């Protein structure tokens, strides 16, 4: 009921965080052309120390996934021997699922985010008419492990980082993927198979 294909990086000096960002950007552009589609992003070479030198895409519609594979960027990168591409094939029925949820809460670890939050809070108080009296939290927080992907803004002058965590799957409800094929903590449920198996194919 599921199809996938994978891409591996051939060069030993490849920067995974820079390069991975381009594949996501393409997925986004495709999503804009055909709004009613669902394609998920998986990292079959995910590790606790690094992101890994490979990426894979998973979906349910074979004919649509083929169209994605035909996108010119991928074809060029293969021709110049930067990428190794697989063919589209069926997902094995003997595996387990993971989420790949992204966490925007981690933004609050950096000064720039706190500044913006407070500036808005001050201005917001004028409607209430009360004096601006902010109240700060304590000194210690605990967070999980995450990796970064470098991203360019869409039709603007900015760039920023995506922060990716890996959660184990638990089954409930119905699904949907975000514009980046990523999962959200709430109200964006989906999953991908953790295809670290049969990777000897590339």
């Amino acid at each position: 009921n599921r199809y996938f294909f994978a891409i591996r990086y051939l060069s030993d000096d490849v920067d995974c965080g820079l390069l991975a960002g381009r594949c996501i950007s393409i997925l986004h552009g495709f999503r804009q052309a055909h709004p009613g589609i669902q394609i998920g992003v998986a990292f079959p070479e995910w590790s606790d120390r690094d992101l890994g030198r490979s990426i894979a895409f998973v979906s349910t519609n074979k004919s649509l996934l083929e169209r994605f594979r035909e996108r010119s960027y991928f074809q060029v990168m293969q021709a110049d021997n930067f990428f190794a591409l697989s063919l589209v094939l069926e997902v094995p029925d003997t595996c387990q699922n993971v989420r790949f949820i992204r966490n925007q809460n981690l933004a609050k670890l950096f000064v720039g985010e706190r500044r913006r939050r407070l500036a808005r809070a001050k201005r917001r108080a004028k409607a209430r008419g009360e004096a601006f009296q902010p109240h700060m939290p304590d000194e210690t927080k605990v967070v999980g492990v995450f990796h970064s992907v470098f991203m360019q803004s869409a039709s603007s002058g900015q760039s920023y980082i995506l922060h990716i965590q890996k959660h184990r799957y638990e089954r409930s409800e119905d699904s949907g993927y975000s514009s980046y094929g990523l999962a959200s903590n709430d109200l964006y449920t989906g999953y991908v198979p953790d295809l670290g198996a049969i990777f000897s194919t590339l």
Partner: protein
């Protein structure tokens, strides 16, 4: 030369601490927040509703370059003593004092935190003087300082010229600066050296932590007054026996040129002779500056 020769340091700060005032208490520390995520992330910025940040440190100056801490050779000792005095009586300590004094009043010891809406520097000393620079953002290495400010540079130069040259004067300075700041401006304290990064703090007597700048980091800024090479003043280097330049990854007084400390150390007999005929040249200014930042000069 000889086997044993040492000088100790003649000029030194303690460390700098950041804090702010409230209506309830005069000393509230600026603190740092840490998230364990070990491998952590952390941040520090002035909190909402504090209009200005204070930074303070103390400085002692001692006339301790007049005599070798240790010397194993009676002939080396006779010369080094004659030289320091031959220099002292022609002046020249004024020149060194002028250079050190200029750096304190300018404020470069604030390193990366100089970018304020207005910085005010106040100095007090153990002899009863007070100095006031209403705005430190406009004073260059090279140029004529505005009136009433040029004057305090002369007055401070005089007190320090004495502190450096006559013994049994116990001279202390207490330097406080005020930084008028932005809405939630980021602050840059000293970092920790490790085998992600961490920041340095100190403990208060009540158990609170505070942000700080290390002693030698304040010191490295004060002694940056070496511009006697290649007849091109540019900006000054931190005094170093080899003329090291970290930004360009090079060395200006490389031993290959004959312009380093060790070649010059061996000509002392000739310099004393000249001073007696005296004008002070760059070669003796360099040497005196190194003796002030004392260390080991051994295994000749």
């Amino acid at each position: 030369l000889c086997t044993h020769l040492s000088y100790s340091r003649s000029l030194s700060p303690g460390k700098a601490v950041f804090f702010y005032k409230t209506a309830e208490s005069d000393f509230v520390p600026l603190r740092i927040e840490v998230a364990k995520i070990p491998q952590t992330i952390e941040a520090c910025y002035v909190p909402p509703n504090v209009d200005e940040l204070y930074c303070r440190f103390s400085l002692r100056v001692e006339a301790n370059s007049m005599r070798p801490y240790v010397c194993s050779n009676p002939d080396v000792l006779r010369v080094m003593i004659g030289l320091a005095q031959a220099y002292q009586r022609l002046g020249g300590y004024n020149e060194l004092a002028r250079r050190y004094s200029a750096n304190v009043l300018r404020g470069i010891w604030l390193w990366r935190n100089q970018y304020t809406q207005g910085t005010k520097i106040e100095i007090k000393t153990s002899l009863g003087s007070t100095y006031h620079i209403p705005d430190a953002r406009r004073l260059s290495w090279s140029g004529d300082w505005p009136e009433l400010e040029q004057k305090q540079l002369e007055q401070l130069t005089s007190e320090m010229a004495k502190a450096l040259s006559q013994p049994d004067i116990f001279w202390f300075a207490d330097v406080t600066a005020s930084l008028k700041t932005g809405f939630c401006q980021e602050i840059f304290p000293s970092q920790k050296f490790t085998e992600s990064r961490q920041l340095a703090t100190v403990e208060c007597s009540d158990g609170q932590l505070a942000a700080c700048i290390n002693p030698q980091k304040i010191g490295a800024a004060l002694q940056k007054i070496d511009d006697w090479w290649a007849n091109d003043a540019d900006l000054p280097l931190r005094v170093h026996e080899y003329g090291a330049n970290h930004e360009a990854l090079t060395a200006l007084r490389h031993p290959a040129t004959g312009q380093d400390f060790y070649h010059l150390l061996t000509k002392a007999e000739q310099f004393v002779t000249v001073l007696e005929s005296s004008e002070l040249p760059g070669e003796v200014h360099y040497l005196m500056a190194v003796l002030v930042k004392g260390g080991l000069f051994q295994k000749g």
